[PDB]
Amino acid sequence: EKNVSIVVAASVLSSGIGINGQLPWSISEDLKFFSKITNNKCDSNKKNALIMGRKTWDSIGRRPLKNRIIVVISSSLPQDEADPNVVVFRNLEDSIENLMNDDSIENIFVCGGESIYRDALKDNFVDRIYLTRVALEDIEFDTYFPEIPETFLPVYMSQTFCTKNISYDFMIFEKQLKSIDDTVDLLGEIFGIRKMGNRHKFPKEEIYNTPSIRFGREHYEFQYLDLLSRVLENGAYRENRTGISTYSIFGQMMRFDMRESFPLLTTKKVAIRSIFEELIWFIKGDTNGNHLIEKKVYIWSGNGSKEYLERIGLGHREENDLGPIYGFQWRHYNGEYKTMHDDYTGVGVDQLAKLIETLKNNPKDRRHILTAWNPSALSQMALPPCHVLSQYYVTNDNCLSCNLYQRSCDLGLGSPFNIASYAILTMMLAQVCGYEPGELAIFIGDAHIYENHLTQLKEQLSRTPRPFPQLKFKRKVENIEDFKWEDIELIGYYPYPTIKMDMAV
Amino acid sequence: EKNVSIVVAASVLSSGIGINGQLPWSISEDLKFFSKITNNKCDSNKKNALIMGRKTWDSIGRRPLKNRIIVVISSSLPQDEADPNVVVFRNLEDSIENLMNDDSIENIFVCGGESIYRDALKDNFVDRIYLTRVALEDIEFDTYFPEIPETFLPVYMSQTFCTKNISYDFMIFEKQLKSIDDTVDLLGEIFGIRKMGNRHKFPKEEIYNTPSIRFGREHYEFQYLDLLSRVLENGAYRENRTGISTYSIFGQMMRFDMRESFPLLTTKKVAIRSIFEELIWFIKGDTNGNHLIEKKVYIWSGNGSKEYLERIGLGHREENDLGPIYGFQWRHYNGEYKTMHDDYTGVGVDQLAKLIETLKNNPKDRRHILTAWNPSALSQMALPPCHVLSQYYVTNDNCLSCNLYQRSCDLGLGSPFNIASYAILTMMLAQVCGYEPGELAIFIGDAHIYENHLTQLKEQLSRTPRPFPQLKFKRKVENIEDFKWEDIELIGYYPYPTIKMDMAV
């Protein structure tokens, strides 16, 4: 009995491996992973064995590897007794005998082609699968990886990495103490909601995304998918200013990486264009809702209709004049807001401009804050600022991190937008100031789920995540308000089908 | 071979158990815990065995317990063969035979007096200890619990509970997968700081408080003591506006409970009086530094000296005229700040008053925000607001929770004060509005440690924590600015000796 694992790097969707006798990508870090994973020996005078087909043996140059015995599955190659680091077997079934004897071989790894992968799974010899998912699908394959059978379960999913603008993950598939559990549960019976642990229950398998991945939830999309589960388990049914009631908890956070990936949800086709047009709308200082409607973006029409505006006591306002919201408080703080058609160039504290000047001249400064809560002009807003405070931080490696506090997040409609919106905003500040994107942390107050999103959000938790895409700018801009949608390149985004959710006006 | 545990409820410091033949406290939940912990059987047709001395057998009334065999250790009591749920042995050594030959007994529990506790440890019969630490020391004992030998290590420590204004914990003392670890480490060698996991390394045992408690870090003081450990492991040496450099990370949070306890650090004698006088100073709208100096509180002298004020370009300011800091922005927002001795009654948005009126009339409201960042009047401040935004939330149980975002935390000098300040403020808002204290969450930006605190904070991590104290008000106040230091009763606070740290002016 010895561990027999599979090492493979396939595409994210079609699961393709190699084209015309060679690989369709050149990722250096992946090959280094193959080296480290196949040289993992626990004893000293022992070496691992790698199994591959002839066409794979040909593709690697017919040369042995460092302290690894190469096993070739060929019906034509002669068993050369000269080379001890390369052995040839006539078939895969006969080749699996270095487990009942040959103690020298510690572990066994299967890394051949489709012909060897398919026969290794159908014969039930595989105990573990090391999968490297590459985000490449607009190309052509000729050799694919067989679909993983239901007997294997995902146990680990790494963070999204990047190499030459190509995103890739690392997953593990396994074939599927007691003294504290019998005490915390007893204290949970004595104290009900007196014990704070009962107020934050661990979600059950029915709302936990990919529950087989227990200890290896490293993909930072789980920071969002586990928040949905945490709301369904502990969310309190509550009313609000709209007719749609919510399930809300208080005090949650999400952490994201922006160096090797771009935090854009893959479990739902997020409209990335609508997020950008809203962000550049904020950066320009514009509070005219029609400008977004004139760009085929209808996300501020509900909160800017004639019925809604007169309902909240703003009948004196034009159709889509939202008012001093983010975008007016960013560029003009404490400015006498008249209408949307007015000229505020020069009035108000330009927080965004001073923020850039502070990030360049004083990086070690701790007060790189951008606020949006102005109590003096709240009754004039069509809607109070949801994402309020935002703090930025420069590391010693010229990286730019971002922290956001959100008073209430509409998980399903507002959180996926706010994740990408401030991720793009951080990258824009990083380019203009000359830094690199770092980490993104979002601190949430009233994390709620509207009751008409339960059917859709329950579907999102059923979809296993995919690696994050890459976001690259097409040109360096002079100022900051010069970005255009054409200057944005989204690389390797293959999400799940979009699910429609209605906005609670 | 079967488990032989010890169940005991001793004092926090002297470890006292019982006085004049009875217990020195009446905690109903503790007895309920003793019942549930001794009725934990896995086999149905099997019963546990409880061992106690004669003087303890007398204290419980000489009556058996529900489906538990009581073993009495007495040299005078006759072995009554009539009662099958009570058996008498002449000594403790002879009484322990129901493990090698008696299958009927599943588990063994030792819960006698000092005579049985000391003999159970000195003879090395104990495999596990269930300790209930009660915060009572101003009384008199007569029977104590033996000091835990070095062979036992803490494995679990529950949250601080409360019963009749008495805090108590629950601890466990034990006698002192593998496939994913060998993959995340490999990815940590390939990618250096490219992998986000390496930027947030798990602290080492040498800076981890009570490293034996791995899975049972439920005491919410660990939310602060593990933040110190996380800074020492991953903190980047950085400069700032003062001569003292720091070790800072970005994006950390802490969680606290205010229902059954009061988040006041026990690893250091925190000056609670100075925290209150600062908090009530904010509520009144006062920005005069001398008023705290006239109350034997010298925490704003460094940032309010004649030398410091002229160094930051405010030489035209009086001695301790701090300016519009928190405390002016709370009660008077966007008010024309003149001097410290002015009458701003009527000018500026009274955020605190509107907050109280909103918490009463509209609890389900999501915009219970109290901000302190006013970019229009930042150059007038002697020091920008460190703790900026604060959001409040009413649960369905008429409880008041609080979320805070802090721009920079001086861990060791500023964090312990800010924890209690917003904890007391939440209780003040809860009483005036008619709610109960709930949860407290603090969201941190630049979590740093000044380099002159390393010797002291490394000492703070060496002392194992103690249960939180209780904070109760002595009277109900009419408004909110009527609180006085005499109206506060701190119950059960037994911290470690105070350690002096210098403020980076």
Ligand SMILES: NC(=O)C1=CN([C@@H]2O[C@H](COP(=O)(O)OP(=O)(O)OC[C@H]3O[C@@H](n4cnc5c(N)ncnc54)[C@H](OP(=O)(O)O)[C@@H]3O)[C@@H](O)[C@H]2O)C=CC1
């Ligand atoms: N992304 C990845 O992880 C990997 C990708 N690849 C790619 O896949 C491609 C190659 O794979 P593939 O085309 O499927 O060819 P294979 O690598 O699977 O090799 C197949 C050959 O092995 C022999 N063989 C296979 N099955 C048997 C059997 N049951 N009994 C006896 N002999 C057998 C035959 O050779 P013979 O003629 O001697 O009988 C057969 O032609 C390449 O492009 C390569 O780059 C390869 C490895 C890994």
Ligand SMILES: NC(=O)C1=CN([C@@H]2O[C@H](COP(=O)(O)OP(=O)(O)OC[C@H]3O[C@@H](n4cnc5c(N)ncnc54)[C@H](OP(=O)(O)O)[C@@H]3O)[C@@H](O)[C@H]2O)C=CC1
């Ligand atoms: N806080 C807690 O968890 C608990 C507290 N207590 C408190 O502790 C106090 C009582 O405990 P304590 O004073 O120590 O007395 P004990 O409960 O330990 O009982 C001692 C008696 O057991 C017999 N005994 C003790 N040692 C031996 C021995 N080595 N060999 C043979 N017989 C022995 C003797 O009985 P004999 O007269 O026959 O010689 C002795 O009088 C009470 O206040 C009680 O309430 C008790 C249990 C739990």
Ligand SMILES: CN(Cc1cnc2nc(N)nc(N)c2n1)c1ccc(C(=O)N[C@@H](CCC(=O)O)C(=O)O)cc1
């Ligand atoms: C069989 N094969 C195809 C191939 C390519 N990429 C993969 N990637 C993964 N994740 N898994 C595989 N099984 C895999 N297989 C191989 C095997 C080894 C080398 C190789 O050159 N290995 C060097 C790697 C050199 C390096 O460190 O850069 C070694 O030292 O083992 C290339 C292709």
Ligand SMILES: CN(Cc1cnc2nc(N)nc(N)c2n1)c1ccc(C(=O)N[C@@H](CCC(=O)O)C(=O)O)cc1
């Ligand atoms: C020997 N003794 C003293 C006593 C009191 N408190 C303790 N508390 C702790 N944590 N550990 C002990 N060993 C302990 N012992 C006892 C033992 C049982 C009961 C008792 O009444 N038990 C009932 C409990 C009734 C209830 O649910 O409140 C039971 O069903 O077990 C009281 C005192």
Ligand SMILES: Nc1nc2[nH]cc(Cc3ccc(C(=O)Nc4ccccc4CCC(=O)O)cc3)c2c(=O)[nH]1
């Ligand atoms: N209650 C409440 N009030 C709010 N006011 C303003 C907002 C922001 C916002 C308003 C609307 C949306 C929205 O429809 N997203 C979306 C989601 C999935 C698929 C497609 C789309 C848009 C369609 C497209 O591609 O055009 C997103 C964000 C907001 C909110 O989210 N909730």
Ligand SMILES: Nc1nc2[nH]cc(Cc3ccc(C(=O)Nc4ccccc4CCC(=O)O)cc3)c2c(=O)[nH]1
């Ligand atoms: N850099 C920086 N600047 C700041 N300006 C204003 C503050 C607030 C503050 C200033 C000082 C303290 C302080 O000495 N605490 C303390 C800690 C442990 C033991 C005893 C004490 C006081 C002794 C006693 O009062 O009994 C706390 C809080 C602040 C800060 O914390 N850091």
Ligand SMILES: O=c1[nH]c(=O)n([C@H]2C[C@H](O)[C@@H](COP(=O)(O)O)O2)cc1F
């Ligand atoms: O950027 C946004 N992010 C967001 O989460 N919302 C959602 C949060 C909440 O569901 C609603 C605001 O309702 P309320 O003002 O009562 O908090 O809008 C709206 C935005 F514009």
Ligand SMILES: O=c1[nH]c(=O)n([C@H]2C[C@H](O)[C@@H](COP(=O)(O)O)O2)cc1F
């Ligand atoms: O309530 C407070 N909390 C706090 O953490 N500081 C410390 C944090 C840091 O040491 C300093 C902030 O100065 P600056 O952020 O301008 O560097 O004050 C000060 C307070 F008054």
